[PDB]
């Protein structure tokens, strides 16, 4: 049977975007998101991170550093009873300085590749799922993927009118999501 999911940006949604974050010391969980994620799991949602990480293509940090940080994030969440169901990332950029990652791709939001991948691997009911992000490109990827509810938060990049045009909900932060969902009945 198919499960509903919350799809999540990383920077600006889960962690404070201090700028090309790739080190444990600069990874700061946003207030209340761990508790919120725990509650979302309890509410029956799969949790799937779908993150653009163009810092890799830019040369700001290596894919290995991202992998190390991601393992740590995964550990840290699991240790607090939050087991992520999937972690997807896109390291690419068409103007990448690092040749290995210099390309157009299907996984860089607004392309919905990461969400489609997660859908297939975890058997996700997209129409009953949510996407949470901070920018237009996230909302565009969500509509392409048939995600039922498109949610912006205010904890990341400043919200643009175009992002709002493409979103259903705007919340202060991911910490507000469980209550907003419960209120839907
Ligand atoms: Zn990609």
Q: Nearest 5°: CA angle at 30, between 141 and 178? A: 65
Query: Residue 135 to residues 56, 84, 152: CA-CA distances in angstroms?
Result: 19, 22, 7
Query: Residue 119 to residues 38, 78, 86: CA-CA distances in angstroms?
Result: 21, 22, 10
Structure tokens that stand for 12 in this block: 């600006």
The CA distance from 166 to 152, in Å, is: 9
Backbone angles phi, psi at 47, to 5 degrees: -110, 125
Enter the resolution in angstroms: 1.6
> Which residue, among 12, 45, 7, 52, has the nearest Cα to 29 in the 3D structure?
12
The Å distance, Cα 88 to ligand 1 centre, comes to 10
The CA distance from 73 to 63, in Å, is: 15
Cis before residue 110, ω within 30 degrees of 0? yes
The CA distance from 162 to 61, in Å, is: 30
Structure tokens that stand for 128 in this block: 């009953």
CATH superfamily ID and name for 1-185: HAD superfamily/HAD-like (3.40.50.1000)
The CA distance from 122 to 115, in Å, is: 10
Cβ-contact 58, 98 below 8 angstroms: yes
Structure tokens that stand for 6 in this block: 């919350």
Q: Which residues contact 171 (CB under 8 A, 6 or more apart)?
A: 151, 152, 153, 154, 177, 180
The CA distance from 103 to 28, in Å, is: 30
The CA distance from 165 to 160, in Å, is: 9
The CA distance from 80 to 115, in Å, is: 25
Cβ-contact 114, 123 below 8 angstroms: no
Residue 81 is among the residues annotated as catalytic for this protein: no
The CA distance from 152 to 20, in Å, is: 20
The Å distance, Cα 63 to ligand 1 centre, comes to 12
The Å distance, Cα 90 to ligand 1 centre, comes to 4
**Residue 22 assigned ligand-binding role:** no
User: Taking the CA of residue 54 as centre, how many other CA atoms within 13 Å lie in the half-sphere pointing to its CB?
Assistant: 11
Burial of 110 (0-12, 13-18, 19+ CB in 10 A): middle
**HEC string for the chain:** CCECEEEECCECCCECCCCCCCCHHHCCECCCHHHHHHHHHHCCCEEEEEEECCHHHHCCCCHHHHHHHHHHHHHHHHHCCCCCCEEEEECCECCCCCHHHECCCCCCCCCCHHHHHHHHHHCECHHHCEEEECCHHHHHHHHHCCCCEEEEECCCCCCCHHHHHCCCEEECCHHHHHHHHHCCC
Hey, where are the domains in the chain? 1-185
Residue 120 is among the residues annotated as catalytic for this protein: no
**Residue 51 assigned ligand-binding role:** yes
Experimentally, the structure was elucidated by: X-ray
Backbone angles phi, psi at 126, to 5 degrees: -65, -40
The CA distance from 123 to 162, in Å, is: 31
């Amino acid at each position: 049977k198919s499960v509903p999911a919350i799809f999540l940006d990383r920077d600006g949604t889960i962690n404070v975007d201090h700028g090309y974050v790739h080190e444990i010391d600069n990874f700061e969980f946003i207030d209340g998101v761990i508790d919120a994620m725990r509650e979302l799991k309890k509410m029956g949602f799969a949790l799937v991170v779908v993150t653009n990480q163009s810092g890799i293509a830019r040369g700001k940090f290596t894919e290995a550093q991202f992998e190390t940080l991601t393992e740590w994030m995964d550990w840290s969440l699991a240790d607090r009873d939050v087991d992520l169901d999937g972690i997807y990332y896109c390291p690419h950029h068409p103007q990448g300085s690092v040749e290995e990652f210099r390309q157009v791709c299907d996984c860089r939001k607004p392309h919905p590749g990461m969400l489609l991948s997660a859908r297939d691997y975890l058997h996700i009911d997209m129409a009953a799922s949510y996407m949470v992000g901070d920018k237009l490109e996230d909302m565009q990827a969500a509509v392409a993927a048939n995600v039922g509810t498109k949610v912006l938060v205010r904890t990341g990049k400043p919200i643009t009118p175009e992002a709002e045009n493409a979103a259903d909900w705007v919340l202060n932060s991911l910490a507000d999501l469980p209550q907003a969902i419960k209120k839907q009945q």
